[PDB]
Nucleic acid binder design. Structure first.
Lengths: 110, 102, 55
RNA sequence: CCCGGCGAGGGGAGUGAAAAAGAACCUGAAACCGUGUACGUACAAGCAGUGGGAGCACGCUUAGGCGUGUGACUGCGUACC
RNA sequence: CGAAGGUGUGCUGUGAGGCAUGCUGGAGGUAUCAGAAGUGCGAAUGCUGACAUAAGUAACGAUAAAGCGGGUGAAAAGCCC
Protein backbone atom coordinates (compact mmCIF):
# COMPACT_ATOMS: atom_id res chain seq x y z
CA UNK A 1 0.00 0.00 0.00
CA UNK A 2 1.14 3.53 -0.83
CA UNK A 3 0.07 6.84 0.69
CA UNK A 4 0.45 10.38 -0.63
CA UNK A 5 0.74 13.85 0.84
CA UNK A 6 1.08 17.18 -0.96
CA UNK A 7 1.77 20.88 -0.35
CA UNK A 8 0.65 23.10 -3.23
CA UNK A 9 1.55 26.76 -3.81
CA UNK A 10 4.42 26.78 -1.32
CA UNK A 11 6.43 30.01 -1.10
CA UNK A 12 9.92 28.93 -2.17
CA UNK A 13 11.99 28.00 -5.22
CA UNK A 14 12.04 24.44 -6.53
CA UNK A 15 15.82 24.66 -6.90
CA UNK A 16 16.11 25.46 -3.20
CA UNK A 17 13.70 22.73 -2.08
CA UNK A 18 15.34 19.98 -4.16
CA UNK A 19 18.57 20.32 -2.16
CA UNK A 20 16.74 19.15 0.97
CA UNK A 21 14.53 16.65 -0.86
CA UNK A 22 17.60 14.79 -2.12
CA UNK A 23 18.68 13.90 1.44
CA UNK A 24 15.81 11.58 2.45
CA UNK A 25 15.12 9.54 -0.71
CA UNK A 26 14.80 5.85 0.14
CA UNK A 27 15.31 6.09 3.91
CA UNK A 28 13.27 4.77 6.80
CA UNK A 29 10.87 7.31 8.26
CA UNK A 30 12.55 7.55 11.68
CA UNK A 31 15.98 8.06 10.13
CA UNK A 32 14.50 10.69 7.81
CA UNK A 33 12.89 12.62 10.67
CA UNK A 34 16.22 12.58 12.52
CA UNK A 35 17.99 13.89 9.40
CA UNK A 36 15.44 16.68 8.92
CA UNK A 37 15.55 17.83 12.55
CA UNK A 38 19.21 18.91 12.27
CA UNK A 39 19.34 20.62 8.85
CA UNK A 40 19.60 24.42 9.05
CA UNK A 41 17.39 25.37 6.12
CA UNK A 42 13.91 26.83 5.74
CA UNK A 43 12.79 24.10 3.31
CA UNK A 44 13.36 21.44 5.98
CA UNK A 45 10.40 22.65 8.04
CA UNK A 46 8.01 22.38 5.09
CA UNK A 47 9.28 18.95 4.06
CA UNK A 48 8.98 17.70 7.65
CA UNK A 49 5.36 18.82 7.89
CA UNK A 50 4.48 17.03 4.65
CA UNK A 51 6.17 13.80 5.80
CA UNK A 52 4.33 13.88 9.14
CA UNK A 53 1.00 14.35 7.37
CA UNK A 54 1.71 11.35 5.14
CA UNK A 55 2.52 9.11 8.13
CA UNK A 56 -0.73 10.17 9.80
CA UNK A 57 -2.72 9.39 6.64
CA UNK A 58 -1.13 5.95 6.42
CA UNK A 59 -2.00 5.19 10.05
CA UNK A 60 -5.58 6.45 10.01
CA UNK A 61 -6.98 5.61 6.56
CA UNK A 62 -5.10 2.39 5.69
CA UNK A 63 -4.21 0.65 8.96
CA UNK A 64 -0.44 0.71 8.49
CA UNK A 65 2.36 0.25 11.02
CA UNK A 66 4.90 3.01 11.62
CA UNK A 67 7.89 0.70 12.03
CA UNK A 68 7.62 -0.73 8.48
CA UNK A 69 7.30 2.48 6.44
CA UNK A 70 9.84 3.87 3.96
CA UNK A 71 10.00 7.00 1.80
CA UNK A 72 9.39 5.48 -1.63
CA UNK A 73 8.98 8.66 -3.68
CA UNK A 74 9.51 12.40 -3.25
CA UNK A 75 9.62 15.23 -5.76
CA UNK A 76 9.16 18.96 -6.34
CA UNK A 77 7.56 20.81 -9.28
CA UNK A 78 7.33 24.47 -10.30
CA UNK A 79 4.17 26.49 -9.77
CA UNK A 80 2.88 29.85 -10.97
CA UNK A 81 4.93 33.03 -10.58
CA UNK A 82 3.95 36.47 -9.30
CA UNK A 83 5.17 39.51 -11.23
CA UNK A 84 6.32 42.75 -9.57
CA UNK A 85 8.05 46.01 -10.51
CA UNK A 86 11.29 47.45 -9.08
CA UNK A 87 12.62 50.91 -10.05
CA UNK A 88 16.26 51.51 -11.04
CA UNK A 89 18.36 54.56 -11.88
CA UNK A 90 17.57 57.19 -14.53
CA UNK A 91 13.89 56.24 -14.71
CA UNK A 92 14.16 52.58 -15.77
CA UNK A 93 11.98 49.81 -14.34
CA UNK A 94 12.74 46.11 -13.90
CA UNK A 95 10.68 42.96 -13.37
CA UNK A 96 10.72 40.66 -10.33
CA UNK A 97 9.48 37.06 -10.31
CA UNK A 98 8.30 35.42 -7.08
CA UNK A 99 8.43 31.66 -7.55
CA UNK A 100 6.41 28.86 -5.94
CA UNK A 101 6.48 25.06 -5.90
CA UNK A 102 4.46 21.89 -5.32
CA UNK A 103 5.85 19.20 -2.98
CA UNK A 104 4.83 15.51 -3.08
CA UNK A 105 5.79 12.68 -0.67
CA UNK A 106 4.87 8.97 -1.07
CA UNK A 107 5.36 6.46 1.77
CA UNK A 108 5.03 2.70 1.45
CA UNK A 109 5.33 -0.52 3.44
CA UNK A 110 6.91 -2.69 0.73
CA UNK B 1 -53.61 31.67 -19.30
CA UNK B 2 -51.69 28.68 -17.93
CA UNK B 3 -52.47 25.02 -18.49
CA UNK B 4 -50.89 23.71 -15.26
CA UNK B 5 -51.84 25.33 -11.94
CA UNK B 6 -51.29 24.82 -8.24
CA UNK B 7 -53.11 21.96 -6.49
CA UNK B 8 -53.34 19.80 -9.63
CA UNK B 9 -52.73 16.09 -10.14
CA UNK B 10 -50.07 15.31 -12.74
CA UNK B 11 -48.12 12.43 -14.26
CA UNK B 12 -44.41 12.59 -15.17
CA UNK B 13 -43.46 12.16 -18.83
CA UNK B 14 -39.64 12.16 -18.95
CA UNK B 15 -36.72 11.50 -16.62
CA UNK B 16 -35.86 9.02 -13.90
CA UNK B 17 -39.31 9.39 -12.29
CA UNK B 18 -41.20 8.55 -15.51
CA UNK B 19 -44.66 7.20 -14.67
CA UNK B 20 -45.12 8.60 -11.16
CA UNK B 21 -47.99 10.74 -9.89
CA UNK B 22 -48.23 13.61 -7.44
CA UNK B 23 -49.59 17.04 -6.59
CA UNK B 24 -48.26 20.46 -7.60
CA UNK B 25 -47.01 22.49 -4.63
CA UNK B 26 -45.92 25.80 -6.17
CA UNK B 27 -45.16 27.34 -9.56
CA UNK B 28 -42.03 29.37 -10.30
CA UNK B 29 -41.68 32.22 -12.76
CA UNK B 30 -38.95 30.60 -14.88
CA UNK B 31 -41.12 27.70 -16.06
CA UNK B 32 -40.64 25.12 -13.29
CA UNK B 33 -42.78 23.37 -10.68
CA UNK B 34 -42.31 21.52 -7.40
CA UNK B 35 -44.23 18.22 -7.22
CA UNK B 36 -44.64 16.27 -3.99
CA UNK B 37 -42.48 13.16 -3.68
CA UNK B 38 -40.77 13.66 -7.05
CA UNK B 39 -37.20 14.55 -8.06
CA UNK B 40 -35.50 14.13 -4.69
CA UNK B 41 -31.97 15.30 -3.87
CA UNK B 42 -29.58 14.87 -0.94
CA UNK B 43 -28.08 18.02 0.57
CA UNK B 44 -25.11 18.30 2.95
CA UNK B 45 -26.27 20.99 5.36
CA UNK B 46 -23.84 22.89 7.57
CA UNK B 47 -24.86 23.67 11.17
CA UNK B 48 -25.56 27.18 12.43
CA UNK B 49 -25.68 27.99 16.18
CA UNK B 50 -28.22 30.75 15.52
CA UNK B 51 -31.80 29.55 15.00
CA UNK B 52 -30.97 26.35 16.95
CA UNK B 53 -30.45 24.24 13.84
CA UNK B 54 -27.93 21.38 13.48
CA UNK B 55 -26.52 19.98 10.24
CA UNK B 56 -26.91 16.67 8.49
CA UNK B 57 -27.74 15.02 5.19
CA UNK B 58 -31.29 16.03 4.23
CA UNK B 59 -33.60 14.82 1.46
CA UNK B 60 -35.74 17.39 -0.35
CA UNK B 61 -37.50 18.09 -3.65
CA UNK B 62 -36.01 19.86 -6.67
CA UNK B 63 -37.80 21.81 -9.39
CA UNK B 64 -38.71 20.17 -12.70
CA UNK B 65 -39.49 21.60 -16.14
CA UNK B 66 -43.18 22.31 -16.64
CA UNK B 67 -43.34 20.74 -20.11
CA UNK B 68 -42.23 17.41 -18.58
CA UNK B 69 -45.52 16.86 -16.70
CA UNK B 70 -49.08 16.32 -17.88
CA UNK B 71 -52.57 16.55 -16.40
CA UNK B 72 -54.03 13.23 -15.24
CA UNK B 73 -57.51 12.11 -16.36
CA UNK B 74 -58.93 9.84 -13.66
CA UNK B 75 -61.84 8.69 -15.83
CA UNK B 76 -59.47 7.22 -18.43
CA UNK B 77 -56.33 6.68 -16.36
CA UNK B 78 -54.10 8.43 -18.90
CA UNK B 79 -52.30 11.67 -19.65
CA UNK B 80 -54.11 14.39 -21.58
CA UNK B 81 -53.87 17.85 -23.13
CA UNK B 82 -55.75 21.03 -22.21
CA UNK B 83 -57.81 23.56 -24.15
CA UNK B 84 -59.66 26.81 -23.41
CA UNK B 85 -63.21 27.95 -24.14
CA UNK B 86 -65.96 30.29 -22.93
CA UNK B 87 -68.98 28.65 -21.28
CA UNK B 88 -71.27 31.23 -19.62
CA UNK B 89 -69.30 34.47 -19.53
CA UNK B 90 -66.06 33.01 -18.21
CA UNK B 91 -63.05 31.10 -19.46
CA UNK B 92 -62.66 27.41 -18.60
CA UNK B 93 -60.29 24.53 -19.33
CA UNK B 94 -61.29 21.22 -20.86
CA UNK B 95 -59.84 17.80 -21.70
CA UNK B 96 -59.16 17.03 -25.36
CA UNK B 97 -59.70 13.26 -25.26
CA UNK B 98 -63.41 13.42 -24.38
CA UNK B 99 -64.32 17.15 -24.37
CA UNK B 100 -65.13 17.34 -20.65
CA UNK B 101 -64.75 20.38 -18.40
CA UNK B 102 -62.28 20.30 -15.51
CA UNK C 1 31.31 41.88 -20.52
CA UNK C 2 28.59 39.47 -21.65
CA UNK C 3 28.29 36.12 -23.40
CA UNK C 4 28.32 35.61 -27.17
CA UNK C 5 26.45 32.26 -27.22
CA UNK C 6 23.82 30.82 -24.90
CA UNK C 7 25.07 28.15 -22.45
CA UNK C 8 23.44 24.71 -22.37
CA UNK C 9 21.59 22.67 -19.75
CA UNK C 10 24.42 20.13 -19.80
CA UNK C 11 26.86 22.87 -18.74
CA UNK C 12 24.41 24.07 -16.08
CA UNK C 13 24.36 20.60 -14.54
CA UNK C 14 28.13 20.25 -14.77
CA UNK C 15 28.62 23.47 -12.81
CA UNK C 16 26.00 22.44 -10.24
CA UNK C 17 27.71 19.08 -9.60
CA UNK C 18 29.29 20.57 -6.43
CA UNK C 19 26.15 21.85 -4.66
CA UNK C 20 24.94 18.77 -2.78
CA UNK C 21 24.46 19.03 0.98
CA UNK C 22 25.92 16.76 3.67
CA UNK C 23 24.02 15.03 6.48
CA UNK C 24 25.13 14.44 10.06
CA UNK C 25 26.98 11.14 10.37
CA UNK C 26 25.35 10.19 13.68
CA UNK C 27 23.91 11.58 16.89
CA UNK C 28 24.88 10.98 20.52
CA UNK C 29 22.92 9.51 23.43
CA UNK C 30 22.94 10.95 26.95
CA UNK C 31 23.84 8.61 29.80
CA UNK C 32 21.01 9.56 32.20
CA UNK C 33 18.00 10.62 30.11
CA UNK C 34 18.49 8.66 26.88
CA UNK C 35 17.91 11.63 24.58
CA UNK C 36 19.62 12.22 21.24
CA UNK C 37 21.64 15.38 20.67
CA UNK C 38 24.44 16.99 18.70
CA UNK C 39 27.84 16.00 20.05
CA UNK C 40 29.32 18.53 22.50
CA UNK C 41 25.92 20.28 22.78
CA UNK C 42 23.32 20.07 25.54
CA UNK C 43 19.96 18.36 25.05
CA UNK C 44 16.53 19.91 24.52
CA UNK C 45 15.59 19.11 28.14
CA UNK C 46 18.75 20.59 29.68
CA UNK C 47 21.25 17.76 30.24
CA UNK C 48 24.94 17.46 29.43
CA UNK C 49 27.02 14.35 30.14
CA UNK C 50 24.53 13.14 32.74
CA UNK C 51 24.06 16.32 34.79
CA UNK C 52 21.08 18.68 34.71
CA UNK C 53 22.37 22.19 33.97
CA UNK C 54 19.37 24.34 32.99
CA UNK C 55 16.01 24.19 34.74
C1' C D 1 -13.50 11.78 10.67
C1' C D 2 -7.93 12.75 10.45
C1' C D 3 -2.50 15.67 10.10
C1' G D 4 -1.66 20.98 10.70
C1' G D 5 -1.02 27.54 14.09
C1' C D 6 -9.24 27.04 16.32
C1' G D 7 -3.85 28.38 9.59
C1' A D 8 -2.51 27.82 3.92
C1' G D 9 -2.51 22.95 1.96
C1' G D 10 -3.82 17.93 1.86
C1' G D 11 -5.95 12.33 2.76
C1' G D 12 -10.63 9.62 3.43
C1' A D 13 -16.27 9.35 3.41
C1' G D 14 -20.42 11.18 0.60
C1' U D 15 -23.10 13.69 -4.58
C1' G D 16 -23.15 12.92 -9.77
C1' A D 17 -23.09 9.39 -16.02
C1' A D 18 -18.19 11.61 -15.14
C1' A D 19 -14.37 15.17 -9.61
C1' A D 20 -6.76 14.41 -13.71
C1' A D 21 -15.98 18.10 -14.34
C1' G D 22 -13.90 20.99 -7.19
C1' A D 23 -14.97 26.83 -8.19
C1' A D 24 -6.86 28.96 -10.36
C1' C D 25 -13.50 24.45 -12.77
C1' C D 26 -15.26 21.98 -21.54
C1' U D 27 -11.13 20.25 -24.71
C1' G D 28 -5.92 20.81 -22.79
C1' A D 29 -1.07 21.52 -28.24
C1' A D 30 4.45 23.67 -28.12
C1' A D 31 8.56 26.14 -25.92
C1' C D 32 10.42 25.33 -20.87
C1' C D 33 11.20 22.07 -15.75
C1' G D 34 11.30 17.17 -13.16
C1' U D 35 11.00 11.41 -11.15
C1' G D 36 11.96 6.06 -12.90
C1' U D 37 14.08 2.20 -16.40
C1' A D 38 17.77 0.27 -20.69
C1' C D 39 22.33 1.23 -23.09
C1' G D 40 26.91 4.70 -23.65
C1' U D 41 30.70 7.91 -21.31
C1' A D 42 36.74 9.89 -16.83
C1' C D 43 44.35 8.98 -22.61
C1' A D 44 40.39 12.27 -25.46
C1' A D 45 40.79 17.50 -30.12
C1' G D 46 36.63 20.96 -34.62
C1' C D 47 28.81 22.62 -38.09
C1' A D 48 27.96 17.12 -34.11
C1' G D 49 25.73 14.14 -39.34
C1' U D 50 26.25 10.37 -43.29
C1' G D 51 28.45 5.21 -45.13
C1' G D 52 30.59 0.68 -42.61
C1' G D 53 30.15 -1.92 -37.88
C1' A D 54 31.31 -5.42 -32.89
C1' G D 55 29.11 -5.75 -27.97
C1' C D 56 24.77 -5.37 -24.45
C1' A D 57 19.24 -5.35 -23.17
C1' C D 58 14.51 -6.79 -24.80
C1' G D 59 9.68 -9.10 -28.09
C1' C D 60 7.96 -12.70 -31.74
C1' U D 61 9.80 -17.33 -33.38
C1' U D 62 8.31 -22.40 -38.69
C1' A D 63 14.73 -23.02 -32.88
C1' G D 64 15.40 -21.18 -39.16
C1' G D 65 15.36 -15.55 -38.64
C1' C D 66 13.64 -11.08 -37.83
C1' G D 67 11.82 -6.50 -35.37
C1' U D 68 12.78 -2.36 -31.70
C1' G D 69 16.45 0.71 -28.26
C1' U D 70 21.68 2.05 -27.45
C1' G D 71 26.16 2.51 -30.08
C1' A D 72 32.91 1.41 -28.72
C1' C D 73 36.11 1.76 -33.32
C1' U D 74 36.86 3.68 -38.47
C1' G D 75 36.32 6.71 -44.38
C1' C D 76 34.14 11.49 -45.91
C1' G D 77 32.52 16.17 -44.15
C1' U D 78 33.83 24.56 -42.44
C1' A D 79 25.14 26.31 -40.70
C1' C D 80 20.70 29.10 -43.12
C1' C D 81 18.97 33.74 -45.55
C1' C E 1 -22.59 0.28 -30.42
C1' G E 2 -19.03 7.30 -30.00
C1' A E 3 -18.43 13.48 -34.37
C1' A E 4 -14.76 17.27 -34.76
C1' G E 5 -10.12 18.13 -32.25
C1' G E 6 -5.39 15.81 -29.35
C1' U E 7 -1.56 11.70 -29.20
C1' G E 8 0.94 6.66 -30.93
C1' U E 9 1.43 2.46 -34.67
C1' G E 10 0.97 -0.07 -39.59
C1' C E 11 0.46 0.25 -44.87
C1' U E 12 0.70 3.11 -49.51
C1' G E 13 1.91 6.96 -54.21
C1' U E 14 7.28 10.34 -58.23
C1' G E 15 5.87 14.79 -54.81
C1' A E 16 2.42 18.44 -52.38
C1' G E 17 -0.24 13.98 -49.71
C1' G E 18 -3.81 9.52 -48.71
C1' C E 19 -6.01 5.30 -46.02
C1' A E 20 -6.86 1.96 -41.72
C1' U E 21 -6.69 1.20 -36.57
C1' G E 22 -5.30 1.54 -30.42
C1' C E 23 -5.71 5.50 -26.24
C1' U E 24 -7.91 10.56 -24.93
C1' G E 25 -12.64 13.49 -25.99
C1' G E 26 -17.95 13.95 -25.25
C1' A E 27 -21.69 16.21 -30.25
C1' G E 28 -21.40 17.06 -34.47
C1' G E 29 -19.31 15.69 -39.81
C1' U E 30 -19.75 15.28 -45.02
C1' A E 31 -18.82 11.42 -50.64
C1' U E 32 -19.14 12.66 -56.21
C1' C E 33 -19.33 16.59 -59.81
C1' A E 34 -19.36 21.87 -60.16
C1' G E 35 -18.91 27.17 -58.06
C1' A E 36 -16.19 31.65 -55.00
C1' A E 37 -11.58 33.13 -52.19
C1' G E 38 -9.35 37.28 -45.74
C1' U E 39 -6.08 30.03 -49.45
C1' G E 40 -0.30 27.54 -47.58
C1' C E 41 5.44 31.56 -43.50
C1' G E 42 11.81 30.89 -40.71
C1' A E 43 13.67 35.46 -41.57
C1' A E 44 11.19 42.14 -42.75
C1' U E 45 16.73 45.69 -35.70
C1' G E 46 8.14 42.59 -38.17
C1' C E 47 3.27 42.82 -34.04
C1' U E 48 0.88 40.47 -29.29
C1' G E 49 1.33 36.59 -25.09
C1' A E 50 4.16 32.84 -22.62
C1' C E 51 8.89 30.85 -21.11
C1' A E 52 14.62 30.49 -20.99
C1' U E 53 20.23 32.23 -20.39
C1' A E 54 23.66 35.06 -17.67
C1' A E 55 22.80 32.95 -11.57
C1' G E 56 20.99 31.22 -6.78
C1' U E 57 25.70 35.67 -9.30
C1' A E 58 25.28 41.77 -8.14
C1' A E 59 22.37 44.18 -4.43
C1' C E 60 19.11 44.89 0.44
C1' G E 61 19.38 53.25 0.06
C1' A E 62 24.04 57.73 4.40
C1' U E 63 29.96 54.16 9.03
C1' A E 64 24.65 58.03 14.94
C1' A E 65 25.69 51.75 17.98
C1' A E 66 24.37 48.58 20.69
C1' G E 67 24.16 44.65 25.48
C1' C E 68 21.38 41.84 28.93
C1' G E 69 16.74 40.04 32.23
C1' G E 70 11.38 39.10 32.19
C1' G E 71 6.23 38.72 29.12
C1' U E 72 3.22 36.94 25.11
C1' G E 73 3.13 33.47 21.28
C1' A E 74 3.29 27.46 16.98
C1' A E 75 7.87 30.37 16.32
C1' A E 76 11.20 36.60 19.08
C1' A E 77 18.20 40.05 16.84
C1' G E 78 13.65 43.78 15.25
C1' C E 79 6.89 43.75 19.29
C1' C E 80 5.61 45.17 25.11
C1' C E 81 7.93 46.23 30.24
Amino acid sequence: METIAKHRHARSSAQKVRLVADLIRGKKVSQALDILTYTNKKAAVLVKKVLESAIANAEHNDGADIDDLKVTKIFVDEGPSMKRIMPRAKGRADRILKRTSHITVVVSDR
Amino acid sequence: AAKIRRDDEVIVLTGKDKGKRGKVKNVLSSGKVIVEGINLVKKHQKPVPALNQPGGIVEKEAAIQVSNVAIFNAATGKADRVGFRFEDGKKVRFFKSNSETI
Amino acid sequence: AVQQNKPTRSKRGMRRSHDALTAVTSLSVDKTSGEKHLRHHITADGYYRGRKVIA
